[PDB]
Amino acid sequence: EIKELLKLGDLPTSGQIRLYDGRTGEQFERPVTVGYMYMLKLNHLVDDKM
Amino acid sequence: REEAVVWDILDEVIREHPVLLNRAPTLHRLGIQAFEPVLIEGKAIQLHPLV
Amino acid sequence: QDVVLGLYYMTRDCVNAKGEGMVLTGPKEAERLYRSGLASLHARVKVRIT
Amino acid sequence: KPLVGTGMERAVAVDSGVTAVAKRGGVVQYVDASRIVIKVNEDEMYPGEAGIDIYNLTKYTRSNQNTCINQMPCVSLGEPVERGDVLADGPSTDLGELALGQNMRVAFMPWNGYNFEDSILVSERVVQEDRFTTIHIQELACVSRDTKLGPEEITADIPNVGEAALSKLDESGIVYIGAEVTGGDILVGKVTPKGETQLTPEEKLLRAIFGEKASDVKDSSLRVPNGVSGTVIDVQVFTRDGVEKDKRALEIEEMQLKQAKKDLSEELQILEAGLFSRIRAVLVAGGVEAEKLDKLPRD
Amino acid sequence: TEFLKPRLVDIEQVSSTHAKVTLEPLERGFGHTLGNALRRILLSSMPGCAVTEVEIDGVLHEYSTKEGVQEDILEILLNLKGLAVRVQGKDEVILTLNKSGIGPVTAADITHDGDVEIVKPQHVICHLTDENASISMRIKVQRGRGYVPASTRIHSEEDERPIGRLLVDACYSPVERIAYNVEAARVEQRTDLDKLVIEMETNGTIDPEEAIRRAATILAEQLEAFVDLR
Amino acid sequence: TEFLKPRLVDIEQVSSTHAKVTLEPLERGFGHTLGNALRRILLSSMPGCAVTEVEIDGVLHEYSTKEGVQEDILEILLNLKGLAVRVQGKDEVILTLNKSGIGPVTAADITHDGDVEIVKPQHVICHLTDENASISMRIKVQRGRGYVPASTRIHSEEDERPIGRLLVDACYSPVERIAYNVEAARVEQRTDLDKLVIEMETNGTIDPEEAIRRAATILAEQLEAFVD
Amino acid sequence: VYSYTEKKRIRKDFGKRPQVLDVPYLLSIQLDSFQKFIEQDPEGQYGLE
Numbered sequence: 001e002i003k004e005l006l007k008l009g010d011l012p013t014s015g016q017i018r019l020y021d022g023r024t025g026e027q028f029e030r031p032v033t034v035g036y037m038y039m040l041k042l043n044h045l046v047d048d049k050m
Numbered sequence: 051r052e053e054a055v056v057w058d059i060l061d062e063v064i065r066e067h068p069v070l071l072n073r074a075p076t077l078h079r080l081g082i083q084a085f086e087p088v089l090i091e092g093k094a095i096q097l098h099p100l101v
Numbered sequence: 102q103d104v105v106l107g108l109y110y111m112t113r114d115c116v117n118a119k120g121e122g123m124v125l126t127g128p129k130e131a132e133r134l135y136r137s138g139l140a141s142l143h144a145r146v147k148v149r150i151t
Numbered sequence: 152k153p154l155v156g157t158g159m160e161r162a163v164a165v166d167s168g169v170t171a172v173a174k175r176g177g178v179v180q181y182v183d184a185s186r187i188v189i190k191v192n193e194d195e196m197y198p199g200e201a202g203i204d205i206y207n208l209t210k211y212t213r214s215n216q217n218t219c220i221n222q223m224p225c226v227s228l229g230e231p232v233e234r235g236d237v238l239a240d241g242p243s244t245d246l247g248e249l250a251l252g253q254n255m256r257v258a259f260m261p262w263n264g265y266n267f268e269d270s271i272l273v274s275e276r277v278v279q280e281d282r283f284t285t286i287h288i289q290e291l292a293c294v295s296r297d298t299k300l301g302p303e304e305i306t307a308d309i310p311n312v313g314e315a316a317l318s319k320l321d322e323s324g325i326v327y328i329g330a331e332v333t334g335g336d337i338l339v340g341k342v343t344p345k346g347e348t349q350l351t352p353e354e355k356l357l358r359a360i361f362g363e364k365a366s367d368v369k370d371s372s373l374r375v376p377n378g379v380s381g382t383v384i385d386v387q388v389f390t391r392d393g394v395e396k397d398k399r400a401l402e403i404e405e406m407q408l409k410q411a412k413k414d415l416s417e418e419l420q421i422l423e424a425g426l427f428s429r430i431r432a433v434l435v436a437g438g439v440e441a442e443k444l445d446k447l448p449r450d
Numbered sequence: 451t452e453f454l455k456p457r458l459v460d461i462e463q464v465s466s467t468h469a470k471v472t473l474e475p476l477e478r479g480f481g482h483t484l485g486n487a488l489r490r491i492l493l494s495s496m497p498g499c500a501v502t503e504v505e506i507d508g509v510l511h512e513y514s515t516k517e518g519v520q521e522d523i524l525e526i527l528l529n530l531k532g533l534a535v536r537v538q539g540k541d542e543v544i545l546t547l548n549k550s551g552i553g554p555v556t557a558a559d560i561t562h563d564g565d566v567e568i569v570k571p572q573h574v575i576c577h578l579t580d581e582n583a584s585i586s587m588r589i590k591v592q593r594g595r596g597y598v599p600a601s602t603r604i605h606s607e608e609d610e611r612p613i614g615r616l617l618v619d620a621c622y623s624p625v626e627r628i629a630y631n632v633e634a635a636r637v638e639q640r641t642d643l644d645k646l647v648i649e650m651e652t653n654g655t656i657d658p659e660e661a662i663r664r665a666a667t668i669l670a671e672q673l674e675a676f677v678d679l680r
Numbered sequence: 681t682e683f684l685k686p687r688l689v690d691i692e693q694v695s696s697t698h699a700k701v702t703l704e705p706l707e708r709g710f711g712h713t714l715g716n717a718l719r720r721i722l723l724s725s726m727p728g729c730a731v732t733e734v735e736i737d738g739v740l741h742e743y744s745t746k747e748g749v750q751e752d753i754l755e756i757l758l759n760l761k762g763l764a765v766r767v768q769g770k771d772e773v774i775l776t777l778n779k780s781g782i783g784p785v786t787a788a789d790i791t792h793d794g795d796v797e798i799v800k801p802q803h804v805i806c807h808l809t810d811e812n813a814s815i816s817m818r819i820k821v822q823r824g825r826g827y828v829p830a831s832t833r834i835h836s837e838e839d840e841r842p843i844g845r846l847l848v849d850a851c852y853s854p855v856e857r858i859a860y861n862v863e864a865a866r867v868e869q870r871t872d873l874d875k876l877v878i879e880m881e882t883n884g885t886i887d888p889e890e891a892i893r894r895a896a897t898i899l900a901e902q903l904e905a906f907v908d
Numbered sequence: 909v910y911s912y913t914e915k916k917r918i919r920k921d922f923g924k925r926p927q928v929l930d931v932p933y934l935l936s937i938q939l940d941s942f943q944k945f946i947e948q949d950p951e952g953q954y955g956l957e
Binding site: 021024025 | 712716
């Protein structure tokens with residue numbers, strides 16, 4: 001069903017895309033998994049840990 | 051106060067000084083190793099991958 | 102980890118790809134070829150080396 | 152709001168109860184980033200009291216963890232909403248939903264050892280957008296104690312300090328409202344009883360020559376913590392009954408005074424507007440008069 | 451040796467935000483070479499305008515809030531950062547936003563000064579709820595390349611700001627998105643030559659054409675160093 | 681508006697063929713912008729001269745063995761690809777090799793021909809075993825840009841070739857190897873800045889330094905239209 | 909049909925079985941137990957009583 005929706009997103013069903021290296025302009029030889037993940041910043045601040 | 055000058059003197063001392071890095075637990079003697087420290091911005095210590 | 106992975110990537114060999122059966126005057130040529138996209142690193146090759 | 156939730160993300164927020172929820176339903180009469188007032192439908196309306204429900208929101212209060220606790224209003228003025236609608240969101244909450252964090256485009260790949268062992272590579276664009284920036288409301292307390300060495304006092308009077316540090320202080324010795332300072336910078340001035348007289352030989356010599364006549368006082372004045380810099384969001388003053396009112400204390404307790412007044416007047420008149428509105432809906436149903444009433448006084 | 455002089459040819463604008471720029475004739479291989487350098491410098495080094503500073507009346511600090519104002523201070527800050535600004539002569543202008551009554555305060559409501567062009571006049575800043583609700587402020591709009599926050603400016607800031615003055619993190623870079631497509635280009639007889647196709651999105655601020663020129667310019671200027679001293 | 685202008689610093693020319701050049705200070709991101717632009721052009725587009733074709737007498741196909749030569753033709757071919765040529769005016773030239781007897785065939789044994797200089801007179805070619813064995817040939821050098829292997833020449837070859845004419849991979853690019861390290865530059869005060877360490881191996885004839893300028897040149901000329 | 913807030917934002921639910929019982933008040937334990945301590949209930953043996 002996830003694969004099915006990736007067609008409706010008009011993006012690769014394997015969820016991998018070929019990426020261009022912004023430094024060199026060389027492509028990475030193979031596609032990689034890209035996409036949105038939900039991230040969080042912890043109560044652990046380096047500010048305190050110093 | 052902390053002017054530009056301060057940083058330069060720090061640089062000269064840190065030059066050729068070795069500093070010790072320690073991780074608990076001290077599993078073995080190499081839980082502490084000596085390195086030449088290189089100053090960077092930020093509050094984070096940088097460690098070499100190999101060690 | 103990553104170290105090993107990169108090393109593995111380079112050393113691993115692959116059917117034809119680009120520039121199979123090229124004969125090279127020394128090692129530096131190899132990298133020049135890869136960087137121009139005229140050869141994959143996986144490509145089987147004869148190199149003259151001491 | 153999280154891209155990938157479970158259906159539970161609404162429930163979680165609901166029960167957390169730090170979000171503000173509509174307890175009758177009706178139409179929103181007034182919207183403020185501080186006050187959300189709603190006119191109920193006659194449905195849920197008590198024939199006893201008035202039908203206006205008032206939700207005062209709280210913005211930027213300090214959590215136990217030093218974290219942010221701020222409410223944002225969700226809906227707009229004049230919106231029709233139902234019982235159990237999400238009026239104002241708590242901190243990590245979107246329109247009904249748990250908004251724990253933020254969602255980014257990740258790429259799974261090895262970088263030049265910047266992602267080495269679960270380490271993370273991240274874009275400047277994150278700072279550009281100001282995502283993952285924390286508000287920390289940190290608390291500090293300045294205490295003026297009484298030793299038998301003499302009662303300590305809070306004044307702007309601070310021996311051998313740079314006038315940089317003096318400049319931000321009021322005559323009371325209190326930091327100005329809204330001033331942005333740094334670690335080491337002086338917030339609140341305090342003086343403490345000293346007692347010297349241990350002039351080892353050399354010291355006496357110089358005191359004679361140059362003068363600089365030593366005034367007995369320690370540097371009790373309230374320093375900011377190390378490597379920490381942010382803005383004063385608010386200040387509080389509690390004077391004990393014995394000693395008389397401080398300048399700054401007096402003026403800020405006067406500020407709070409007029410606060411209570413204004414808020415209470417608003418309260419009365421908001422609910423009074425509801426009452427009065429209801430009487431017109433009552434007097435017009437079985438006594439057709441809108442000419443005479445509209446232009447007569449209200450009380 | 452046959453070098454090839456590449457010329458600026460196509461300059462299509464699909465939208466005010468989006469512009470397509472084609473560059474021919476590119477010699478083989480330099481599609482990629484130029485593609486990258488261009489992009490990098492484009493986004494980081496392109497001078498743009500952004501809100502630098504604000505004084506709002508009845509507003510001591512970014513955390514509090516005024517009556518009859520829907521947005522929090524910080525959030526209105528966020529709005530102003532987003533304001534697309536075109537300055538002609540002077541580098542730092544003081545825009546005055548004065549609005550009254552019930553209504554959504556758009557950029558058009560700002561008192562319109564001669565040397566300033568407001569790119570997105572429709573852009574909301576704040577919503578005035580109350581009929582007696584009155585908002586005034588003086589917002590400082592500066593020119594700058596890349597991104598400098600409040601915290602960097604404040605560090606070396608002998609420029610002692612008055613109380614109430616609210617610094618904004620400066621999102622200067624007007625370039626929102628930019629990529630290149632290297633595709634072989636229509637030479638009436640020659641085969642190998644190609645065009646560089648730049649797909650480019652910005653917040654109005656910099657014009658497509660001018661962007662190009664100034665980018666290549668600075669690139670070239672940096673190239674000076676190598677050519678010059680040996 | 682403020683630029684950052686870089687200047688030339690260290691010029692570790694450990695060999696004439698090998699020169700590292702250290703470059704500071706560089707504005708952030710331009711380490712790779714410039715590192716990259718340099719590199720691409722350096723290798724793929726640098727005009728140079730190299731051995732393209734060869735005919736050895738008694739050697740009509742490249743896989744055969746010639747009488748008294750220890751090396752197979754294949755190995756000798758590969759040696760000659762590497763051989764460093766300096767021609768001044770002429771675009772296409774045909775050098776003659778005549779050597780006999782026992783011993784080591786070095787570049788010296790090439791026919792002088794005024795305008796052409798052999799950069800490596802002591803470059804290894806062939807080991808000739810019996811004194812009865814004689815080696816004679818004509819090697820052709822052409823001027824051209826970048827690298828074109830034998831198999832890609834076979835691609836654009838409507839130009840039909842004779843028997844005996846053994847084509848070899850053309851190493852035109854005088855840049856042998858190139859990379860740039862982007863180490864932390866931290867100039868006083870502003871730390872974000874970085875260093876460009878440009879490590880280059882060139883092919884003797886042309887000095888590494890000159891390679892630098894030639895790259896920037898060719899690039900710059902492109903830039904012409906756009907500055908205007 | 910849905911409320912004004914759901915009408916404003918739906919989240920697509922891939923749930924296969926229909927949740928028959930609605931999720932209980934998650935804080936009930938606390939609320940209800942503390943209530944029992946002070947609950948004015950003369951005959952009911954709870955807290956004070």
